[PDB]
Ligand binder design. Sequence first.
Ligand code: ZN
Ligand code: ZN
Lengths: 94, 37, 146, 82, 156, 177
Amino acid sequence: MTGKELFEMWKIINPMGLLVEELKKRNVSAPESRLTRQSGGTTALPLYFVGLYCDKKLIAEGPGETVLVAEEEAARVALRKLYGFTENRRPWNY
Amino acid sequence: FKNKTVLKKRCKDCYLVKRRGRWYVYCKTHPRHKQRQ
Amino acid sequence: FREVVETTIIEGRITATPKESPNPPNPSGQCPICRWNLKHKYNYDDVLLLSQFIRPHGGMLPRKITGLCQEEHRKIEECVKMAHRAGLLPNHRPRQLNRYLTRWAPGSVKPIYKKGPRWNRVRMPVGSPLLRDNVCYSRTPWKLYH
Amino acid sequence: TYSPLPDDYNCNVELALTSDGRTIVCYHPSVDIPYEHTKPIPREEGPMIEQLSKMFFTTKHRWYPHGRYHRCRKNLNPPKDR
Amino acid sequence: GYVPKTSLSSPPWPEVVLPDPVEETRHHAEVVKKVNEMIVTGQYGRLFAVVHFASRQWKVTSEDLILIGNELDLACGERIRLEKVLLVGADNFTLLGKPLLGKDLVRVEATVIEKTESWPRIIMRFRKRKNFKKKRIVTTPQTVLRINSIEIAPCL
Amino acid sequence: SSFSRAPQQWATFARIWYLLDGKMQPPGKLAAMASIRLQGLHKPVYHALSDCGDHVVIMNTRHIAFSGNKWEQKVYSSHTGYPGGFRQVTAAQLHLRDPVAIVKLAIYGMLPKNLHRRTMMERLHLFPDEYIPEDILKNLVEELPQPRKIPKRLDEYTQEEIDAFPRLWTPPEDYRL
RNA sequence: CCUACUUCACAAAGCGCCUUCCCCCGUAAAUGAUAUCAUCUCAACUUAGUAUUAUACCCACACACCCAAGAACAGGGUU
Ligand SMILES: [Zn+2]
Ligand SMILES: [Zn+2]
């Protein structure tokens, strides 16, 4: 699993729904998806950054080609942060 | 006008004026003195 | 400043005239520029400085009246020409390409059809050589030719 | 109040020297995007090459095909890193 | 020496007033203490490090691979400590040596994962119309190292 | 960090839209900025083969300003290819004919002289006046600072600034002026 | 371009006929400072002074035979 990604190893569907479930378990209101940054919205190569905000607090933001894809990726990033499987997490100890 | 590298006033009424980028000697009394740099 | 008024009968009346600001930084200086420590510290765009030596219609004022040095009067005259050509004195006029630092009158310069070889290039003057000694805060000196 | 660089973007940088002065510590926590700085989520060959060039802001040249020579020189199993 | 405000009267750059040395030293002590407490509590994830090994500087992290272009006189699988660590950095803080960090601060450990020879490199000389043509093949020895761990200690 | 591979790559290599205002700005400095952005030399991930250029939208190109007498001295030379087809036109004439040619040519000359130059120019959008197409406006991301700070006119200077600036000399009272 | 004339003859030609439309700047002046006159101004500026050639032309588009279209291909017509 070194170099692998959390959802590369554990395939999931509806990461936004799964994140909503996790926040409900943690007794937290559903996150608000918001457009933090965007570029070339009307072009064929857009860049959208979508951040999920918990009571006006950013929990995770993700990039994408469309707003839906960016929101989905932001949900995945939020899930990674919640589960502690972030890319910059502590290495495994050998 | 006569083209001259060195402009010289020939009479009293000859006057030097820099116009359209270059010097000219104009003269009302003797228009013969007209010189252009 | 005296102004001539007609009604024909014509007479001259002296009106309010500005006075030099109190406490010059460098009293006992040759010209006003030196008195106020501006020897090499003004440019074509310093309209506040330049307009103080300008007739209401844009003409320069005589050196005898202004008290400026010969070199400082020349510098001010050139800077005023540049400011007029750049349009920084819209109110000082006799009665559409944006420019600045134009040394020559626009109507007296011919196009550079044949710029010479690299070693003998014909360069386009920029600014005025009279301001060559202005205070330079940049590593490289001002390029008077482009 | 002096700041080495604007603190608005990419992190809040704080430089320091250790007491011995032989190492430099930098504390740079990332700065989150304020909620107020965000917007709500909204809810023939010739003509074809012209359309593609307009779409992707490229030139026509890259949309024309290439010969078998190049198509077969191209490596179909390139090495992959990371 | 007053000068009226003209374009060239003042320098074109903003005036910067550096913090007074005493207050700045107190602030440095505060920041260093904060970072040291982060290290003590283990508030970091991946650590990277710029380490000067062989003759070059490598940006390194745990599990990384490094290809030294020479034999190291070490048995394969042997563990080593890389000692010239110029920089150690985390998500929220970085430590810079002047020019090297102390041994007590950082401990970068590697392992000789492989010893090999480089692919044949061709050295050809040629000069036209001189009958001058020479060819040589060189295989430089190489050692692959795997960086196992990067450790930091609260020694600031 | 923590992005998936494809979103991370897309974000890293996405092309941003920049806006330059050419009003009273030197076309050369505008072109330097635009050429850097078009090549992508403003990105740390830059590489000639990565196609990392960005979009640059320059407005008010009709209102650029040349230093010196360049409007009259600078000459743009072209040849139709036919005998007697050599055309030399001054900067002022070229500007009057095409209000975009000057900036377009400056950026073209500043770009690298290879096959990517015209692809880069395809990402350059020059508009003579303040009007910009709506799609381009929505695409815009950032506005670059104008390279040259426009000097103020007397008509623009505030009375407070005029008062602050000292009077330099005592004009003789008995003078016509 | 072929109505005449002519070479000639279901048409090609001239010796025949028809149509041909915009400037460029060298200087001459007005007002006016530096240099309170004066001064056409690589001073600001006002005219002769204009190019930023104005336009005109073309703009549709799926066998076989004929063609004023044509080397082939292509093009026009086939009601
Ligand atoms: Zn005479
Ligand atoms: Zn003096």
